[PDB]
Nucleic acid binder design. Structure first.
Lengths: 276, 276
DNA sequence: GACCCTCCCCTTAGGGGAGGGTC
DNA sequence: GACCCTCCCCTTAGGGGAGGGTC
């Protein structure tokens, strides 16, 4: 009190690094009361340690340093408001995280569900829960025509809402006794929606709808141009055999298996058609 | 598909900056499929745009870039776990924020409560809600002896638990008909606790207790060595006059009014003594 | 005429030394 | 022998130009 504290003494007493103290000295946020002109040593009075209280508390909640310089000036009423502001920003970060957390969870449900598929190449008839999607007319686009770039607009809408970018790429087409793959063209191309947040301002060439909840004759396999059509053939036959009645387009989903620029690419395809 | 996309084309299609793309190219996170040897132009195939999906989703949740390079390698089962890890970290950040949010709120209740004090210099008898505190023996320390450095240990305990550092500094002393300020010495010095988180490992020279809930004869004023003692005198007299019976030490609280290295320092003092 | 490229400087809040005095 | 000081280099993920070619 009747002498000075060396920077190291303040460091131990305020539980603040010596390097932090020098830095706060440099940005004129908290400078020592006296710097020995010959030795350059920094000296602090006991009375000024109180200024480190407002600086540590603010640093704990994350406010920027230059932001603090404006905080030490303001009076108690103004500081009160300041905290009200911080509260607004924390609730913001909380909401962002809560939602994120849910999105991650949904991504995992679907990730695992496809991960533990009964078997590949086989036609399975299962009871599906609905899957909300955002689609758009597939202007002529066909199985041998689609490009990732074709989903660009769909992906930007889903991206603003979900933050996360779809894992799978969808397409739909009329159920017909297709002879060849060139005989087919997609009605719509779509991407699943995860979040339930409103899309900023969806344009009218996008439709928000769903793959209906219900019963579907499904089949999943690993992608190959030959297999895409051959497996569709199994479905077309499985339905003809059981004499089932289709009540929807054929839904086609293509999920990437790894996202590594190193390995050879491989996707998982999944075709479902709703039956009575 | 049968040609290449220029960096700008990819930029518009994936909603990723050109500068981001070059940077992902530099850190070998996502490099173009072909770079024209003479012009240096970067060229991307439609097929590789899919790698930006895993990169954008991860970037949205905050995972580091070099962290991503390890994510694109791992397979679907491993990626599933990865998300489980992210979920752990998000819940962590949520908890940190929730608590922070509460602490901020409490800081504001007290900040305002003292902010809208009835009047200064007057003795008010009010019904107080308890205030949990952490105290320590005040080894000889007296009104003209205390230093901020005296609260160093107390402050480090409260700091690990509350994150926030106490606003006020407390002291207590036996209630006596004090003749002079030199006649007094503090029994304990204390600092209020906000959070209800357990202190890592409090040492036995610290006591976790409280200023009891109950009725107190209080007085708040602006600090001055003369006023500290003169106002105590009002309290000593107010109790003698009303013939009240004190049932606790005199509690002394000192709150800083501004934390600015510019303005002259000024504190708010507040003395309360519990009566029957 | 738009596009694209390669430097180059800049941003938060310090932590890590290294070389050289000082309480 | 501890302490303290002044450079100096380094860290994330790019955004901003500037000077100079290119689709």
């Amino acid at each position: 009190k009747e002498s000075y504290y060396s920077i190291g003494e303040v460091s131990k007493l305020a539980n603040v690094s010596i390097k932090a103290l020098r830095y706060y000295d440099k940005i004129d946020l908290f400078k020592p009361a006296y710097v020995d002109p010959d030795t350059s040593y920094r000296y602090y009075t006991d009375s000024q340690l109180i200024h480190l209280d407002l600086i540590k508390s603010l640093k704990y909640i994350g406010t920027p340093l230059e932001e603090m310089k404006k905080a030490q000036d303001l009076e108690m009423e103004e500081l009160f408001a300041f905290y009200t502001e911080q509260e607004r920003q924390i609730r913001e970060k909380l909401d962002f995280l809560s939602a994120l957390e849910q999105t991650i969870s949904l991504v995992k449900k679907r990730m695992k569900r496809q991960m533990e598929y009964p078997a590949l190449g086989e036609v399975f008839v299962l009871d599906e829960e609905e899957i909300r999607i955002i689609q758009t007319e597939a202007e002529g686009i066909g199985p041998e025509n689609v490009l990732n770039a074709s989903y660009s607009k769909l992906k930007k809408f889903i991206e603003s809402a979900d933050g996360f970018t779809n894992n799978s790429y969808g397409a739909t087409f009329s159920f017909q006794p297709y002879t060849s793959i060139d005989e087919m063209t997609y009605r719509h191309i779509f991407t699943p929606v995860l979040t339930n947040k409103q899309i900023s301002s969806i344009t009218p060439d996008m439709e928000i709808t769903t793959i209906p909840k219900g019963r579907y004759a499904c089949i999943a396999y690993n992608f190959s141009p030959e297999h895409y059509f051959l497996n569709l053939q199994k479905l077309i036959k499985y339905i003809a055999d059981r004499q089932l009645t289709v009540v929807s387009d054929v839904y086609a989903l293509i999920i990437p298996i790894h996202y590594s620029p190193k390995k050879q690419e491989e996707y998982r395809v999944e075709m479902k058609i709703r039956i009575l």
